[PDB]
Amino acid sequence: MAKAAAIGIDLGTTYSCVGVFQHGKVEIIANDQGNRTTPSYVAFTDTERLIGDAAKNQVALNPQNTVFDAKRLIGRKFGDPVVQSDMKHWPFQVINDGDKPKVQVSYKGETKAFYPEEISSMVLTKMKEIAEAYLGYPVTNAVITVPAYFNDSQRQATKDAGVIAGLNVLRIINEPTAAAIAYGLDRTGKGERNVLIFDLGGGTFDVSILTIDDGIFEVKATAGDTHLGGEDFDNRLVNHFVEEFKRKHKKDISQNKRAVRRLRTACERAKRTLSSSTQASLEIDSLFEGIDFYTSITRARFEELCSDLFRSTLEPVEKALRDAKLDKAQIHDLVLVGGSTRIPKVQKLLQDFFNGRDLNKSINPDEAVAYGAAVQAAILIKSTR
Ligand SMILES: Nc1ncnc2c1nc(Cl)n2[C@@H]1O[C@H](CO)[C@@H](O)[C@H]1O
DSSP states (O other): OOTTOEEEEEEOSSEEEEEEEETTEEEEOOOTTSOSSEEOOEEEOSSOEEETHHHHHTTTTOGGGEEOOGGGTTTOOTTOHHHHHHGGGOSSEEEEETTEEEEEEEETTEEEEEOHHHHHHHHHHHHHHHHHHHHSSOOOEEEEEEOTTOOHHHHHHHHHHHHHTTOEEEEEEEHHHHHHHHTTTTOSOSSEEEEEEEEEOSSOEEEEEEEEETTEEEEEEEEEETTOSHHHHHHHHHHHHHHHHHHHHSOOOTTOHHHHHHHHHHHHHHHHHTTTSSEEEEEEEEEETTEEEEEEEEHHHHHHHTHHHHHHTHHHHHHHHHHHTOOGGGOOEEEEESGGGGOHHHHHHHHHHTTTOOOBOSSOTTTHHHHHHHHHHHHHHHHHO
């Protein structure tokens, strides 16, 4: 029953996703708000702890006590220059507990501090309860994914997050490996298979090159930008609309925190529409000083606004190829991961770089990692018996 069942969890920087392999198919499990992915956010309020959508939904009202980006801290020492650099951009406090970072917040009127694995365990507990509500029984066996570049300390702290969350961690697997499993790229028989995974998420960009030799995975190269993602494209749309509002009304809205956040969420929404329509409409009632902001933008203008950022995704692709010592024609498969890979211009740039090659994109790119983890969790629990 529950003991013969296992889930796959993609514990993402900005969003998490959970899947289960049963009756010959992967089911990506929708949360209680009907969403197939859940924000990796934990909010501490005057009455409760919120996780996911409810936590992300109140971030503007409670920024000091809304934790996100715990994955950027997990398994790291406080003195790590990555931690010191990132801390300057977070509205929540990060403290030092014997060279270990802790996020410090106000919860039920009291000061509390949490290790990154404790924050990540609250996200994992939510994914576990989402799976349990779908299945009708508690599932505790899980495969959890991590970036291919995570070291032993980051992998161990992720497993520790799983244990705190009440999960039996069958294995910690690499995200690009789970994505290659999702497409069955490890079951093509004999001979070395070179796979490139292009993973453009909400806040990070990762390029991974793997060689699959008779089911055995080997990481040949990892490249990318830890501070490039979908939110930079949302921000480019924001600056455009701030300048358009100034041209139409001779008013600068950039200082009105509420106006900027409402514009930001509307921009994120319009950006998604632009992946399947050649235009998107913004409909913001009383954006600033009672002025409605009803406008539109073409996909062509959006592509211009992010042109330099889309083009910059090809430098880590070339860098990974040189590190792996492979030419483009030596790559057998191209896999898309991350919601931002749905952007048609991004697909076109990657396909043209690989000389007109087909892309593996039939699985929801924001779900491919949880999909593969779910497949691996099923194989692993079946071998355990
Ligand atoms: N249809 C889409 N077109 C463009 N961007 C998208 C799309 N879906 C998602 Cl999710 N994202 C973005 O992916 C990230 C999460 O993986 C977020 O930045 C989200 O906006």
